Design a protein around this nucleic acid. Structure first.
Ligand SMILES: [Cl-]
Ligand code: NA
Ligand code: NA
Length: 314
DNA sequence: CCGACAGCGCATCAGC
DNA sequence: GCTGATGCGC
DNA sequence: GTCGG
């Protein structure tokens, strides 16, 4: 239908983010690509697309050029540009953002090979990103995610049977594949070394293989199923018990669902973030956080019917 | 016209 | 050494 | 880049 248009917008988005360092223009192009990707008709003109929310005058003009010529002069030039294409590519390395990519390209470091012969110029995260470059770009089939969940739930309970661990993200919504694994962790003793002991055990059984970052509340690293399976990205967050289910709700998503749930909350007189759900006074003064002991409690606070994660796509 | 567009944990830099 | 800023990812 | 105050 409009794959040519959405690919064009996505490509424009990446270059704004990675090369121009214009994050808001990146998101504008992404939003336009998303709304067009859902549009159930083949677009015949920029004017037609303009009617959609997120598509404005500039994108309408670009669509008109694309429909009449089959390309975008601006994009064609960008693709051919050595500096811009190299910067854009380097950002595919985890740990390499627009700033590092620009600095690397400035000094003639443009390829994965260039990165390999300049390890001294890479920080720990970037070296890991380089090491697992191909693996990190692979999807994870649900069956592997289940096997990964089996290991995590098993080892967590082995450390302390009172831990509560939930694998969230699109996986919890029943997705057939995932980009990574996002684990939410809590314990009755923690409210508003618990994380360390879990990471340590996962390393002990050789599930966790590398560490990108690690503090008292957040771990970001690499894992791998026993055999060879690709190495996978895994995050683990330690959340206070009284904020756990607000966290589970938020990190389960989806993004559109969270947006819809916050809107309904306000219309019912509540504000919902990833941490707490709080009532609003007659002027807008937010009160103390409300007690939450399940996902359903959040729904019951705003007079909503409990939606299964499976149905939380929108 | 012009400000918002999410906010925060961790690693590391910049400055004192 | 320290504090605050920045880069990065999510 | 787009939206909306
Ligand atoms: Cl709060
Ligand atoms: Na529009
Ligand atoms: Na990157």
């Amino acid at each position: 239908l409009n794959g040519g248009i959405t690919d064009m917008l996505t490509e424009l988005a990446n270059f704004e983010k990675n090369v121009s360092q214009a994050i808001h223009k990146y998101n504008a192009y992404r939003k336009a690509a998303s709304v067009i990707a859902k549009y159930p008709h083949k677009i015949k003109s920029g004017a037609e697309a303009k009617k959609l929310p997120g598509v404005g005058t500039k994108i309408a003009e670009k669509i008109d050029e694309f429909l009449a010529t089959g390309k975008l002069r601006k994009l064609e030039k960008i693709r051919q540009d050595d500096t811009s294409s190299s910067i854009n590519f380097l950002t595919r390395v985890s740990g390499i953002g627009p700033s590092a990519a620009r600095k690397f390209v400035d000094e003639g470091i443009k390829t994965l090979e260039d990165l390999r012969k300049n390890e001294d110029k890479l920080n720990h995260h970037q070296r890991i990103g380089l090491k697992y470059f191909g693996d990190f770009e692979k999807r994870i089939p649900r069956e592997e995610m289940l096997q990964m969940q089996d290991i995590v739930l098993n080892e967590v309970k082995k450390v302390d049977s009172e831990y509560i661990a939930t694998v969230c993200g699109s996986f919890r919504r029943g997705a057939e594949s995932s980009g990574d694994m996002d684990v939410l962790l809590t314990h009755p003793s923690f409210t508003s070394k618990l994380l360390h002991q879990v990471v340590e055990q996962l390393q002990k059984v050789h599930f966790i293989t590398d560490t990108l970052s690690k503090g008292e509340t957040k771990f970001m690293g690499v894992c791998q199923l026993p055999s060879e399976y690709p190495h996978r990205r895994i995050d683990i967050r330690l959340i206070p018990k009284d904020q756990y289910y607000c966290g589970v709700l938020y990190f389960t998503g989806s993004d559109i669902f969270n947006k819809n749930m916050r809107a309904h909350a306000l219309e019912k007189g509540f504000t919902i973030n990833k941490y707490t759900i709080r009532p609003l006074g007659v002027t807008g003064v937010a009160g103390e956080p409300l007690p939450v002991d399940s996902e359903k409690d959040i729904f019951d606070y705003i007079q909503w019917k409990y939606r299964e994660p499976k149905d939380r796509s929108e």
